[PDB]
Amino acid sequence: PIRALDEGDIALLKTYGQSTYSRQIKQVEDDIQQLLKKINELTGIKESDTGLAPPALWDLAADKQTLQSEQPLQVARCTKIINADSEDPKYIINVKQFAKFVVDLSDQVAPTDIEEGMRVGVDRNKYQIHIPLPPKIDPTVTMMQVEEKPDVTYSDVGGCKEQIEKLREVVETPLLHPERFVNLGIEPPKGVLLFGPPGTGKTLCARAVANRTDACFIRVIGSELVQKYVGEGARMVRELFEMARTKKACLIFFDEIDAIGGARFDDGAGGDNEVQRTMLELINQLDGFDPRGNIKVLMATNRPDTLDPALMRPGRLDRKIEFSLPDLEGRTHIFKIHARSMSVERDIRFELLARLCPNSTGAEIRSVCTEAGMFAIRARRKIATEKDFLEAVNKVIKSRYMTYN
Amino acid sequence: TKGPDAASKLPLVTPHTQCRLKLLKLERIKDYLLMEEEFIRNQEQMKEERSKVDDLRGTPMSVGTLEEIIDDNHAIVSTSVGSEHYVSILSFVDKDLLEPGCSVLLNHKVHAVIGVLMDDTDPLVTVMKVEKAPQETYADIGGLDNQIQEIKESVELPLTHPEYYEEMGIKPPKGVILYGPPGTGKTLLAKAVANQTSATFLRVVGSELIQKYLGDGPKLVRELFRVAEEHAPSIVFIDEIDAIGTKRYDSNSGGEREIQRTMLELLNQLDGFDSRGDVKVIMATNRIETLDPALIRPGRIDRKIEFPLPDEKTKKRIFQIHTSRMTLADDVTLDDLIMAKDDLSGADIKAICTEAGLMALRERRMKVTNEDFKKSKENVLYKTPEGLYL
Amino acid sequence: LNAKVRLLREELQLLQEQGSYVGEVVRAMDKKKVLVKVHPEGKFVVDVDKN
Amino acid sequence: LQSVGQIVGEVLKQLTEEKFIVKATNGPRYVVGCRRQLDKSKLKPGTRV
Amino acid sequence: GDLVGVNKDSYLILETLPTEYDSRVKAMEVDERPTEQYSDIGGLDKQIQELVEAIVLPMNHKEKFENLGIQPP
Ligand SMILES: Nc1ncnc2c1ncn2[C@@H]1O[C@H](COP(=O)(O)OP(=O)(O)OP(=O)(O)O)[C@@H](O)[C@H]1O
Numbered sequence: 008p009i010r011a012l013d014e015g016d017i018a019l020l021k022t023y024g025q026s027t028y029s030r031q032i033k034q035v036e037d038d039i040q041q042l043l044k045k046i047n048e049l050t051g052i053k054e055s056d057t058g059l060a061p062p063a064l065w066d067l068a069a070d071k072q073t074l075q076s077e078q079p080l081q082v083a084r085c086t087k088i089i090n091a092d093s094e095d096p097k098y099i100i101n102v103k104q105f106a107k108f109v110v111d112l113s114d115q116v117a118p119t120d121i122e123e124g125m126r127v128g129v130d131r132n133k134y135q136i137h138i139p140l141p142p143k144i145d146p147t148v149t150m151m152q153v154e155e156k157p158d159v160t161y162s163d164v165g166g167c168k169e170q171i172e173k174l175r176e177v178v179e180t181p182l183l184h185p186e187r188f189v190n191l192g193i194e195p196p197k198g199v200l201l202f203g204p205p206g207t208g209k210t211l212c213a214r215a216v217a218n219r220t221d222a223c224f225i226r227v228i229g230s231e232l233v234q235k236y237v238g239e240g241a242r243m244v245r246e247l248f249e250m251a252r253t254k255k256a257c258l259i260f261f262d263e264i265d266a267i268g269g270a271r272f273d274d275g276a277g278g279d280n281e282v283q284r285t286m287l288e289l290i291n292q293l294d295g296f297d298p299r300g301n302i303k304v305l306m307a308t309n310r311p312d313t314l315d316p317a318l319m320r321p322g323r324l325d326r327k328i329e330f331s332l333p334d335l336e337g338r339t340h341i342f343k344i345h346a347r348s349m350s351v352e353r354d355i356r357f358e359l360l361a362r363l364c365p366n367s368t369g370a371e372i373r374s375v376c377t378e379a380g381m382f383a384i385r386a387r388r389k390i391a392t393e394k395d396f397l398e399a400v401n402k403v404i405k406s407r408y409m410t411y412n
Numbered sequence: 413t414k415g416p417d418a419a420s421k422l423p424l425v426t427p428h429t430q431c432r433l434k435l436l437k438l439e440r441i442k443d444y445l446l447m448e449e450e451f452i453r454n455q456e457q458m459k460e461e462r463s464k465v466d467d468l469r470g471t472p473m474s475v476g477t478l479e480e481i482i483d484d485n486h487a488i489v490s491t492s493v494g495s496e497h498y499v500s501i502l503s504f505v506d507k508d509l510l511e512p513g514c515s516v517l518l519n520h521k522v523h524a525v526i527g528v529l530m531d532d533t534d535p536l537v538t539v540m541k542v543e544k545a546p547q548e549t550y551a552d553i554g555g556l557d558n559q560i561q562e563i564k565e566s567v568e569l570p571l572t573h574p575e576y577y578e579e580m581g582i583k584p585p586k587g588v589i590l591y592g593p594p595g596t597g598k599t600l601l602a603k604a605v606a607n608q609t610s611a612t613f614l615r616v617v618g619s620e621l622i623q624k625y626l627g628d629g630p631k632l633v634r635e636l637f638r639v640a641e642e643h644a645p646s647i648v649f650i651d652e653i654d655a656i657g658t659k660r661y662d663s664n665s666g667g668e669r670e671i672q673r674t675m676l677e678l679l680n681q682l683d684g685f686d687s688r689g690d691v692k693v694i695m696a697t698n699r700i701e702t703l704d705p706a707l708i709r710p711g712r713i714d715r716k717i718e719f720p721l722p723d724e725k726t727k728k729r730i731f732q733i734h735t736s737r738m739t740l741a742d743d744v745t746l747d748d749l750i751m752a753k754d755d756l757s758g759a760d761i762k763a764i765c766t767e768a769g770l771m772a773l774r775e776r777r778m779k780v781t782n783e784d785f786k787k788s789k790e791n792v793l794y795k796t797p798e799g800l801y802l
Numbered sequence: 803l804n805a806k807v808r809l810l811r812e813e814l815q816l817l818q819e820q821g822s823y824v825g826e827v828v829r830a831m832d833k834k835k836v837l838v839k840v841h842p843e844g845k846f847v848v849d850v851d852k853n
Numbered sequence: 854l855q856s857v858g859q860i861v862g863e864v865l866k867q868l869t870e871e872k873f874i875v876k877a878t879n880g881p882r883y884v885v886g887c888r889r890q891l892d893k894s895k896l897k898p899g900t901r902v
Numbered sequence: 903g904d905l906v907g908v909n910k911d912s913y914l915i916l917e918t919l920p921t922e923y924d925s926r927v928k929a930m931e932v933d934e935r936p937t938e939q940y941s942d943i944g945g946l947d948k949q950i951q952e953l954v955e956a957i958v959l960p961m962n963h964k965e966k967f968e969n970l971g972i973q974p975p
Pocket residue numbers: 163164165166167203204205206207208209210211212307308309333341344368369370371373679683684706709711
């Protein structure tokens with residue numbers, strides 16, 4: 008009992024209930040769309056900045072720099088000088104990803120400054136050496152290091168006194184005052200694992216460490232250590248620890264190390280043994296058949312129960328520190344720190360607010376202060392009041408206890 | 413500091429009805445477009461050293477990863493096949509702009525540094541930009557006044573009036589999570605933000621940052637936030653984030669560990685060691701309870717916005733909005749559908765309107781009616797024992 | 803017969819002409835230039851022809 | 854000094870008497886002819902050539 | 903299995919090469935011998951004694967092992 012629209016039904020519904028302007032509107036909209044397409048087509052495509060310098064800094068005749076000094080020397084690592092056979096050196100080279108070769112020098116004005124593994128330059132057709140090069144630096148690991156100190160001090164970390172003291176001891180006192188440790192005959196811990204509920208001042212304490220320390224600080228991107236090409240992650244961690252050893256006093260800061268390696272149980276993880284392998288290399292570097300030098304490690308993690316026991320062992324992570332939820336004094340101090348810069352009344356009870364926010368983290372308290380300011384803004388008021396802070400607490404901490412009176 | 417990318421969008425013709433005023437407005441848009449087209453045509457119709465410099469530049473220029481720049485005219489580059497060469501740098505290159513890892517350009521044959529190509533953004537992350545702007549303004553969102561206010565305070569006020577916050581030393585929220593049942597405006601309130609924002613909008617779906625190989629998901633997340641930080645202000649909208657971000661349990665498989673690694677990379681980008689620019693994140697979720705606390709943390713997600721099923725007045729707003737463009741008859745009182753205390757999302761209400769229109773068309777009538785709306789309500793909605801309480 | 807012979811000769815020429823690579827266009831940067839990645843080796847910026 | 858080495862490969866498919874599919878180790882797959890005196894039936898799928 | 907230099911084009915075995923060791927394999931050896939003690943490991947006297955036997959004794963007193971018919975694992 009439901010007819011189907013015929014030719015006439017459709018030819019009348021498109022022509023009977025109809026505005027006398029509908030056709031013109033439709034045509035004009037289609038024209039606008041087509042014109043937009045055509046305009047985008049004509050002016051489309053910008054000029055992708057290619058890196059050209061401003062004119063008058065260039066130097067033509069560089070076609071001669073391209074025809075002379077032409078040799079686009081490949082880089083090779085002399086892995087064996089074949090004993091030099093006294094005369095007739097007959098060096099060996101290890102052009103990576105390409106081949107091994109037996110070659111000689113060519114116009115090498117210092118045939119003695121060749122060594123083994125010196126990263127020589129080698130021509131394309133005849134593989135004679137032309138010029139040595141300095142050792143590889145691995146730009147990824149090179150930029151892993153922190154250069155600009157973050158603007159966080161040991162005064163914006165409120166509610167963490169014992170943890171700050173332990174971290175300061177382990178990470179700074181062996182660096183700035185070795186006299187006490189050598190006097191007492193105690194080798195201070197070399198390795199700290201900061202663990203606690205998400206958001207308690209772990210990375211904030213790491214930032215404060217980075218700001219205070221006068222020593223190499225290496226923030227390790229947990230994603231940069233995982234790659235394709237099995238063995239690449241292990242190679243990167245090896246080179247990272249090599250550079251750390253090169254530096255006089257180094258402070259590595261593996262953040263969210265739960266990414267790089269938990270338990271080693273593979274079972275169905277046959278495809279995830281590469282991460283376990285790089286974690287094993289990290290373990291070896293942290294403590295193995297070799298002194299580690301003046302390298303101190305920081306390791307931040309919310310969940311230090313998925314981690315490998317071989318990594319959590321107190322020969323690699325020696326001073327495990329827990330960032331617990333701050334007590335009432337800590338919460339009051341965090342409120343004071345975070346509301347120092349806020350435009351607030353002069354009689355707000357931050358002790359009361361710390362009481363109102365139990366089992367709350369420093370990030371939670373920061374959010375409370377921000378929402379108090381936001382409530383003040385949402386009323387055209389310049390000074391956030393105790394009422395606004397209480398509203399912010401109610402909105403952030405919680406979002407009936409009539410049995411607990 | 414390349415600058416906002418924005419999203420070009422034409423004006424909006426206020427009268428939705430088919431009348432001469434709408435025709436005049438559309439004709440004005442069209443005539444301006446025609447003048448622009450003819451102006452471009454006339455520019456190109458009325459229109460040496462750099463040409464020869466480009467001729468000297470290689471014809472099929474290759475792209476290689478610079479590594480350990482040396483001297484002032486010689487650097488080591490990579491061929492993107494693992495091999496690396498001790499190449500020279502022509503004077504054409506900028507210099508003082510090459511950095512290790514930068515995807516420099518190399519002459520095809522002689523292999524000399526001749527360009528820098530500082531636009532090596534991956535296609536996977538260039539596609540996820542917003543160049544159009546969906547035509548879903550805030551006037552298409554019935555109700556949700558509090559949710560709209562929250563998101564405006566988070567991603568609009570900090571760009572339109574950046575004096576309120578500096579006037580009290582407060583940093584506005586950098587992260588919002590829109591959580592709620594299946595269909596309540598969670599995606600409309602990102603579409604409206606994209607429509608009304610001057611910032612670079614970046615659509616993403618949590619099921620898209622996951623990649624096949626090892627270490628590629630984290631790399632994609634890092635690249636996404638790198639581009640989102642180069643373009644500023646920018647908003648990154650991760651729809652259905654519970655694709656990646658679910659609770660971080662102790663994995664036994666390898667793919668699960670890689671997915672959690674991607675999630676940790678996202679966490680570090682949201683709130684990590686170093687810093688975060690003016691990139692604001694909006695995640696969307698159906699089931700928030702299953703998300704990891706470290707992700708829902710109120711340093712990465714300052715605001716959490718629930719989108720509950722609409723109440724009566726909001727439902728009336730939805731019906732008004734979705735029947736506005738409909739030739740509603742005078743026999744229809746959109747109150748019987750409102751009052752029924754049944755779970756009705758805005759999506760359900762729109763489906764009800766569409767099905768009522770289809771019922772009218774089936775009955776051969778172009779004007780909907782109350783019986784049509786009743787039938788549509790009955791036939792659209794698909795989905796405690798009696799007397800157990802009371 | 804002339805048409806048949808010419809067809810065969812032209813087929814011979816066009817088939818003994820060298821092949822061609824296939825690449826994916828990353829971005830049509832600049833006019834007359836196109837950044838294209840050719841599998842499996844690296845990506846070049848090709849100078850597109852006038853056709 | 855004038856003895857250019859060969860390339861080791863494996864037979865795969867045994868096409869017509871004069872055609873053999875051979876995969877070169879660490880290399881592509883060709884269709885190749887067989888030397889006249891080499892004699893046949895000693896090149897079965899998997900045979901090294 | 904032997905390292906021989908070979909002509910690039912004809913691939914003809916030219917003069918042979920004695921031996922090749924990677925830089926990492928050369929570094930893969932103790933330069934500065936560690937030295938603390940045996941007494942510096944407590945508790946596992948049984949394990950240390952067993953390892954000392956099964957490693958050192960075959961190395962130094964090798965002859966007596968085959969004299970008595972012992973296989974030094
Ligand atoms: N004890 C504290 N004192 C002051 N501010 C704090 C404290 N704890 C947290 N905060 C605030 O919280 C944020 C710091 O969070 P942080 O990066 O330390 O978290 P986290 O514990 O490393 O968390 P996760 O690793 O789970 O992301 C900043 O807003 C900081 O102001």
